[PDB]
Design an enzyme around this catalytic site. Sequence first.
Site, PDB file in Angstrom:
ATOM      1  N   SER A 176      -3.074  16.776 -29.403  1.00 55.94           N
ATOM      2  CA  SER A 176      -2.150  17.707 -28.778  1.00 55.94           C
ATOM      3  C   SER A 176      -0.746  17.130 -28.658  1.00 55.94           C
ATOM      4  O   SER A 176       0.222  17.897 -28.548  1.00 55.94           O
ATOM      5  CB  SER A 176      -2.659  18.076 -27.388  1.00 55.94           C
ATOM      6  N   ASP A 217       7.776  12.267 -19.921  1.00 51.33           N
ATOM      7  CA  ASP A 217       6.669  12.631 -19.040  1.00 51.33           C
ATOM      8  C   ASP A 217       5.563  11.579 -18.993  1.00 51.33           C
ATOM      9  O   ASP A 217       4.851  11.494 -17.986  1.00 51.33           O
ATOM     10  CB  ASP A 217       6.053  13.979 -19.456  1.00 51.33           C
ATOM     11  N   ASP A 257     -18.733  17.323 -24.635  1.00 54.19           N
ATOM     12  CA  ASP A 257     -18.181  15.974 -24.737  1.00 54.19           C
ATOM     13  C   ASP A 257     -17.802  15.419 -23.374  1.00 54.19           C
ATOM     14  O   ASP A 257     -17.818  14.198 -23.186  1.00 54.19           O
ATOM     15  CB  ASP A 257     -16.982  15.959 -25.680  1.00 54.19           C
ATOM     16  N   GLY A 258     -17.469  16.289 -22.412  1.00 53.92           N
ATOM     17  CA  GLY A 258     -17.260  15.814 -21.052  1.00 53.92           C
ATOM     18  C   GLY A 258     -18.512  15.193 -20.459  1.00 53.92           C
ATOM     19  O   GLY A 258     -18.443  14.159 -19.786  1.00 53.92           O
ATOM     20  N   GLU A 303      -9.101   7.921 -24.322  1.00 48.46           N
ATOM     21  CA  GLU A 303      -7.727   7.437 -24.196  1.00 48.46           C
ATOM     22  C   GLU A 303      -7.468   7.043 -22.753  1.00 48.46           C
ATOM     23  O   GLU A 303      -8.264   7.324 -21.853  1.00 48.46           O
ATOM     24  CB  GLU A 303      -6.700   8.485 -24.640  1.00 48.46           C
ATOM     25  N   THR A 335      -8.797  12.924 -31.824  1.00 46.07           N
ATOM     26  CA  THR A 335      -8.981  14.375 -31.913  1.00 46.07           C
ATOM     27  C   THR A 335      -8.760  15.102 -30.589  1.00 46.07           C
ATOM     28  O   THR A 335      -8.804  16.339 -30.555  1.00 46.07           O
ATOM     29  CB  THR A 335     -10.396  14.681 -32.421  1.00 46.07           C
ATOM     30  N   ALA A 336      -8.504  14.375 -29.515  1.00 45.98           N
ATOM     31  CA  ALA A 336      -8.407  14.934 -28.169  1.00 45.98           C
ATOM     32  C   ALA A 336      -6.940  14.956 -27.735  1.00 45.98           C
ATOM     33  O   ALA A 336      -6.114  15.515 -28.467  1.00 45.98           O
ATOM     34  CB  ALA A 336      -9.324  14.143 -27.248  1.00 45.98           C
ATOM     35  N   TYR A 337      -6.601  14.443 -26.548  1.00 48.27           N
ATOM     36  CA  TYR A 337      -5.241  14.486 -26.035  1.00 48.27           C
ATOM     37  C   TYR A 337      -4.223  14.008 -27.081  1.00 48.27           C
ATOM     38  O   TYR A 337      -3.177  14.629 -27.265  1.00 48.27           O
ATOM     39  CB  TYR A 337      -5.206  13.620 -24.781  1.00 48.27           C
ATOM     40  N   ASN A 338      -4.532  12.920 -27.787  1.00 48.21           N
ATOM     41  CA  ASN A 338      -3.649  12.393 -28.833  1.00 48.21           C
ATOM     42  C   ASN A 338      -3.235  13.477 -29.822  1.00 48.21           C
ATOM     43  O   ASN A 338      -2.063  13.575 -30.224  1.00 48.21           O
ATOM     44  CB  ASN A 338      -4.382  11.253 -29.552  1.00 48.21           C
TER      45      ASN A 338
END
Lengths: 259, 259, 259, 259
Positions: A162, A146, A45-46, A119, A157-160
């Site tokens: 977590s 932070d 995905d990157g 994001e 499904t990514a940073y959000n």
Amino acid sequence: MKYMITSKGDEKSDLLRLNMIAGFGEYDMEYDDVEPEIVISIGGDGTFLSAFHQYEERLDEIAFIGIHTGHLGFYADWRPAEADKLVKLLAKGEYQKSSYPLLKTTVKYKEATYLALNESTVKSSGGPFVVDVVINDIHFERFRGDGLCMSTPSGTTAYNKSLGGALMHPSIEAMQLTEMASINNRVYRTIGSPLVFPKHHVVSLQPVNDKDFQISVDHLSILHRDVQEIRYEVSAKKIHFARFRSFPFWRRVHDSFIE
Amino acid sequence: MKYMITSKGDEKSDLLRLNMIAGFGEYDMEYDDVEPEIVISIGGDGTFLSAFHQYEERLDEIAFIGIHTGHLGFYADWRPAEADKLVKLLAKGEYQKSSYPLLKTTVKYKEATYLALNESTVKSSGGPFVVDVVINDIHFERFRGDGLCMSTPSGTTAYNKSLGGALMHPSIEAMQLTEMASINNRVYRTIGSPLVFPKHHVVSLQPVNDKDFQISVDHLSILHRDVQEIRYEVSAKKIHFARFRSFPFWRRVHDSFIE
Amino acid sequence: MKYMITSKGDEKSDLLRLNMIAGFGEYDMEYDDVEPEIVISIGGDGTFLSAFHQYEERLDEIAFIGIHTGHLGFYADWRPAEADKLVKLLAKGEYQKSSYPLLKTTVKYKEATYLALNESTVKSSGGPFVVDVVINDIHFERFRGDGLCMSTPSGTTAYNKSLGGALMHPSIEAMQLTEMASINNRVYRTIGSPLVFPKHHVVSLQPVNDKDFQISVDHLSILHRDVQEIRYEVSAKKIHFARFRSFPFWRRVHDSFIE
Amino acid sequence: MKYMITSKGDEKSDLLRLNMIAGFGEYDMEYDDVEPEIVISIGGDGTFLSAFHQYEERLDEIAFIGIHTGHLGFYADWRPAEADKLVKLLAKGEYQKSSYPLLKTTVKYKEATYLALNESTVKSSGGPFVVDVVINDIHFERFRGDGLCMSTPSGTTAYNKSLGGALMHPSIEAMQLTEMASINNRVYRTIGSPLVFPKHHVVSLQPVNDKDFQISVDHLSILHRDVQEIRYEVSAKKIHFARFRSFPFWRRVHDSFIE
Ligand SMILES: NC(=O)c1ccc[n+]([C@@H]2O[C@H](COP(=O)([O-])OP(=O)(O)OC[C@H]3O[C@@H](n4cnc5c(N)ncnc54)[C@H](OP(=O)(O)O)[C@@H]3O)[C@@H](O)[C@H]2O)c1
Ligand SMILES: NC(=O)c1ccc[n+]([C@@H]2O[C@H](COP(=O)([O-])OP(=O)(O)OC[C@H]3O[C@@H](n4cnc5c(N)ncnc54)[C@H](OP(=O)(O)O)[C@@H]3O)[C@@H](O)[C@H]2O)c1
Ligand SMILES: NC(=O)c1ccc[n+]([C@@H]2O[C@H](COP(=O)([O-])OP(=O)(O)OC[C@H]3O[C@@H](n4cnc5c(N)ncnc54)[C@H](OP(=O)(O)O)[C@@H]3O)[C@@H](O)[C@H]2O)c1
Ligand SMILES: NC(=O)c1ccc[n+]([C@@H]2O[C@H](COP(=O)([O-])OP(=O)(O)OC[C@H]3O[C@@H](n4cnc5c(N)ncnc54)[C@H](OP(=O)(O)O)[C@@H]3O)[C@@H](O)[C@H]2O)c1
């Protein structure tokens, strides 16, 4: 039609790329990485995120496809062993297009705008992070902590995730704001919960003391100095995917997180 | 027009009710609690929830208004001191209507359906809670834990919020599924995250061993025995509010949770 | 006895400092900021944290006291209006000592050690954060995410709390490890939960690819390059407070977070 | 020495039980389920929890051992294939004892006391749950929500973990209080965070309106009527395990939750 292929750049991916180019050689398909109509990403995905940002000036003209060389990807919908089947389907034009919403970020100082597929996040440049959060011109909260993360639907499904955000089906035109390590006590108060915003709502972050911020847009991360405002809204632009079979979002979620 | 007023039933609320009836007496407004076109709730959001369920067979014909006698409410948009101003505005017809999405619950055994304005929840009848979660006929997860909560958008500020769900603007036609105390280990796996579903997605809960469940719909809570399926979807029905001034959702959220 | 006073450095704090020095002038109390036996901090908990690190080579010889000029502090136990009462009590020696546990951090490259009163945290220097977490020489997890926070008991009300850690009574000799935004999916797995460690347990963080880390110890934050190991353990050293009255930890927690 | 064996009651467990009894037949080991000195549990952690409560009047005289027939257990430290090795070690007396802390629950009406190995929880009998939380006679918070969970250290991997509690090494003599779905807004306020209490601290729950509560102690769950107080403290009593090899707590945690 015109197409191009980006590669993660390892041995597996380049060779799969060369194979597909050779395979495309047997159809009316012209390699063109300036004005492609199909953009194939081979990697993770990157790699797909980089392909999207390479061509984000012509999202209206492009259908994206991803092949994941390693683990399954949320954007890379195809396994290497299926490359030849994909070559054949793309050449024959047997594909539907689907669209995902994107996030517009505006940074005012004197103004830069970015498009995100996953994001955009905001953190301080080292000191404490304090910003005023303004929703449709109404002051909503003074955020201390932070940082903050504004996610598209497919970014949920990514940073959000977590950060405790909800997963949102990409047919919903929305953005989701999550907190990073908010301070809450007698005097300092944040909502705590993720916030889901519809199209046309504008979330504005405004400095309180420090004006320097580390801002990320997908993989890109830049120190912005002397910032007056960060503005978030659902973009009018959308990413388009070439779809050749049923692979529901919730099935991708199941396959990636459950088993 | 035809109207009725329900009261929390304390002294404050009944007298405010009598005052408005007297006030309505001076206009072309007929009290009618069988086929009202306007339903005024005086009390808290619990009182408003009861008014909604009293008239949920004619949501197409009714505009709801709430007056909060105690703290501010998310549905009760008006303070007691404003009752007389409200009487005058309603009689003159100077109001817009706005709509919020609702959640449809179907329980199959041999089938009951409910409408929720806040949420529907499922817990066991005492033993352990285990259900299979099926999204659009695709098996998504085996959930073990205390229970599950499916929230409308306007419900996201209530039980959903306490469970870590996102707050969702009510212009988004969606439902949100949150976990209650999920067990996650080597063998047992849930998504963890809240899930936000668009219109037309069907979330089905299916028993694994025990077939008895305590099911709640807003305030109502009933032990259902010998259940084969619980089905969740965004309802085709909507609640309609009489709106007389600007009071944005995010301002209600700010006023209720921040200050 | 020998004493010194640090000040936040605003007008309120310096003048309160001068007043106490004048007040101490009327007793057998010698100002000495090299070898003090009593260290008075006037400001906020940030001021107190700086006083602790100023004298951390002689924690065995010092009893600390804090006066909070702004909001109440967890270490600054006294209001400005009580300064004169404090002067009198300290001079007369009518005080008990209490001790809080501290955290030892060792960074190996070729080895630096730090003492923290609140916590030590580890983040990447920009790229992704990946470390192996080794508990008493046993490999426990590969952590991917934004970072890790190791808190003392009295630190549990600070950064640890914002990360979802438990609040721990300071009579418990322990340290608590919390996650910052861990990635959990099919392939990547962290415990998720905070971890509470007794005295003599050693938590070791070991790089996986990148060896550069931004490490914080209370207020201090430094980029460490070419790191081989970060080691956490409960320190043998403790901070000592001069106590003149009952102010239970849970009352400080109530006053700071509830009302 | 005197011993007894409880069985989960399935075919696997009974036969493994019969085998060990036959095996014990070849040593100076007397089966005695009234005054045993060794209690072997064969099944899962639920079976072990029942063995503990069967003999909780003589925890001072008993060392417990668990064999897990299904998945690994946190109390059942042994696999079936190792039963014969265990028979031999127990008979030869080649074992150390280790102790875990336990939680004392007192319910006052007119007073019942319970011992928990995992946790005690409190919920309402259907209506809303509201209690005042009093720590060492000091009023700490008014809790509104679904309930409260007080966990021992070894219980922290169970219900406590699902509620967001920390995992605590069992050498720490403490109890941990976690929230179930707390309501937090403008008017209602809870600490949010888990709370870790040392020995000798007394947490008291006191009704606000309703006096009926569903109280659980490990597997047992009972509706208590007309309750005046629920009191939590770390018990003076401890459970004793027969240990024959090194199996660190953090290794059990890794094996159960990571892989
Ligand atoms: N704490 C966190 O969870 C965290 C922190 C920072 C960044 N990120 C993510 O990293 C992205 C950009 O970094 P990068 O991918 O260039 O390098 P990276 O930081 O190494 O990528 C992080 C991982 O996120 C995966 N990923 C990407 N998009 C995803 C999606 N929509 N849903 C689920 N997983 C997804 C990537 O999959 P592949 O391995 O297939 O590339 C990769 O494994 C951001 O957009 C952000 O969402 C996550
Ligand atoms: N753990 C929890 O947070 C939890 C647990 C169970 C039920 N509930 C809520 O209780 C509702 C039904 O109970 P009830 O109201 O008849 O009696 P209740 O349990 O006493 O009501 C709970 C509280 O929720 C408030 N509330 C209602 N709708 C809300 C909304 N949309 N957003 C924010 N707060 C809202 C009510 O305000 P008023 O005081 O103005 O009535 C009341 O104070 C459910 O729909 C559920 O959302 C919450
Ligand atoms: N996300 C977060 O919550 C976060 C992030 C980074 C750092 N911090 C905290 O900041 C500390 C060092 O920074 P600083 O104080 O020099 O400047 P700072 O970042 O401005 O301080 C942050 C706030 O934490 C308060 N604080 C300090 N010790 C505390 C404790 N034990 N319990 C509760 N609150 C406490 C301070 O109170 P005063 O106003 O009285 O000084 C200050 O308001 C760290 O030790 C860390 O715990 C918190
Ligand atoms: N939401 C939740 O997570 C939740 C809710 C209610 C109860 N429980 C747990 O259930 C226990 C009593 O029920 P039960 O065991 O008789 O039947 P149960 O509800 O079927 O047991 C629940 C599961 O918890 C496991 N377990 C027991 N002690 C544990 C520990 N210390 N650490 C980790 N997992 C543990 C059991 O393992 P085995 O399969 O080996 O028996 C079982 O799989 C309570 O003490 C509570 O901790 C958990």
